[PDB]
Amino acid sequence: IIGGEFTTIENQPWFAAIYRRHRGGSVTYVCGGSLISPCWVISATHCFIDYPKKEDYIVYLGRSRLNSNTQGEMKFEVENLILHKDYSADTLAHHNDIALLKIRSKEGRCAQPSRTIQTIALPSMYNDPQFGTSCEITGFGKEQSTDYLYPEQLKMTVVKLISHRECQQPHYYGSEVTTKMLCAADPQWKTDSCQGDSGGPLVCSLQGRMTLTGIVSWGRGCALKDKPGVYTRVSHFLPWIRSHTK
């Protein structure tokens, strides 16, 4: 997250921290995700597509720090890693950039909700906020495009939903943006998602409910003029979500 503010997991208690085991045993952060039910985290296929072996990955819930334990955190193995069969990546764009991780602990339990661990609601079908709505993004991604390190402390910011018409303008992203994606940016381009925020939630208020509207997917640089963040439009994937979590 470029700009915005530091936060703790109690403010975004559906945030999932996804890590990968290396041969040798070093463990590095991969991507964010969102807990949509006690046994299911939703994320981005592009996070896993190079290393699609579920045994390689660890999921934490109730975690506020990247490389240290948060009191109350729960650690899960991935029982299933479901990537979207129609995934494709262009030089920029990721199409159908959505993934489902079925989580289960060493004792074969799912998440127990708490102050630091809660599910986020899915939107109703094709039901997105109006363009110019303010939504929240959460992640451990870079604080600056030129940073080598990720922040140790979770961050969140606010960006405004951009209309498809605006986002498909040539000097923005042209046809690289589709109706299955949402664009969001700061009017001053001063805050954005960045590398390492992939898979993380875009949350908006819909009929008085915090709702998972989007999943961090792609973008040209971060917090660049005319280069919005691009998000998987979750309200266009409910059949795929429903089918693979039955």
Ligand X SMILES: N=C(N)Nc1ccc(C(=O)O)cc1
Q: Does 193 participate in binding ligand X (rule CB under 6 A)? A: yes
164 is an active site residue = no
Q: How far is CA 194 from CA 31, 219, 235, in A?
A: 11, 8, 23
Q: Does 194 participate in binding ligand X (rule CB under 6 A)? A: yes
Q: Does 192 participate in binding ligand X (rule CB under 6 A)? A: yes
Among 9, 100, 111, 222, binds ligand X (CB under 6 A): 222
- Interatomic CA distance for residues 44 and 84, integer angstroms: 9
Q: Interface with ligand X by CB under 6 A: which range of 34-42, 56-64, 173-181, 214-222?
A: 214-222
Residue whose beta carbon is closest to ligand X: 219
198 is an active site residue = yes
* 12 neighbors 37 (Cβ within 8 angstroms): no
Q: Interface with ligand X by CB under 6 A: which range of 81-89, 100-108, 149-157, 219-227?
A: 219-227
Q: Interface with ligand X by CB under 6 A: which range of 21-29, 54-62, 114-122, 216-224?
A: 216-224
Print the binding letters for residues 223-242 with ligand X: x by CB under 6 A, - otherwise: ----x-x-------------
163 is an active site residue = no
- Interatomic CA distance for residues 233 and 37, integer angstroms: 19
| Alpha helices (H) in 68-172, listed in sequence order | 164-167
Tell me whether residue 198 or residue 235 sits nearer to ligand X (CB atom).
Answer: 198
Measuring CA to CA, which residue among 194, 178, 180 is closest to residue 227? Answer: 194
Token readout for 147 is 């940073």
Measuring CA to CA, which residue among 58, 44, 52 is closest to residue 193? Answer: 44
| H helix count then E strand count, the chain | 2, 15
Q: Interface with ligand X by CB under 6 A: which range of 102-110, 149-157, 160-168, 188-196?
A: 188-196
Tell me whether residue 38 or residue 189 sits nearer to ligand X (CB atom).
Answer: 189
- Which of the residues 43, 46, 193, 217 is marked catalytic? 46
Among 202, 219, 233, 236, binds ligand X (CB under 6 A): 219
Measuring CA to CA, which residue among 188, 177, 172, 134 is closest to residue 156? Answer: 134
Q: Does 84 participate in binding ligand X (rule CB under 6 A)? A: no
Q: Does 17 participate in binding ligand X (rule CB under 6 A)? A: no
- Interatomic CA distance for residues 242 and 228, integer angstroms: 29
Token readout for 146 is 């030129």
Sorted by sequence, the CB contacts under 8 Å of residue 93 that are 6+ apart come out as: 173, 176, 177, 178, 181, 218, 230
- Catalytic residue ranges: 46, 97, 198
Binding-site ranges for ligand X (CB under 6 A) = 192-195, 197-198, 216, 218-219, 221-222, 227, 229
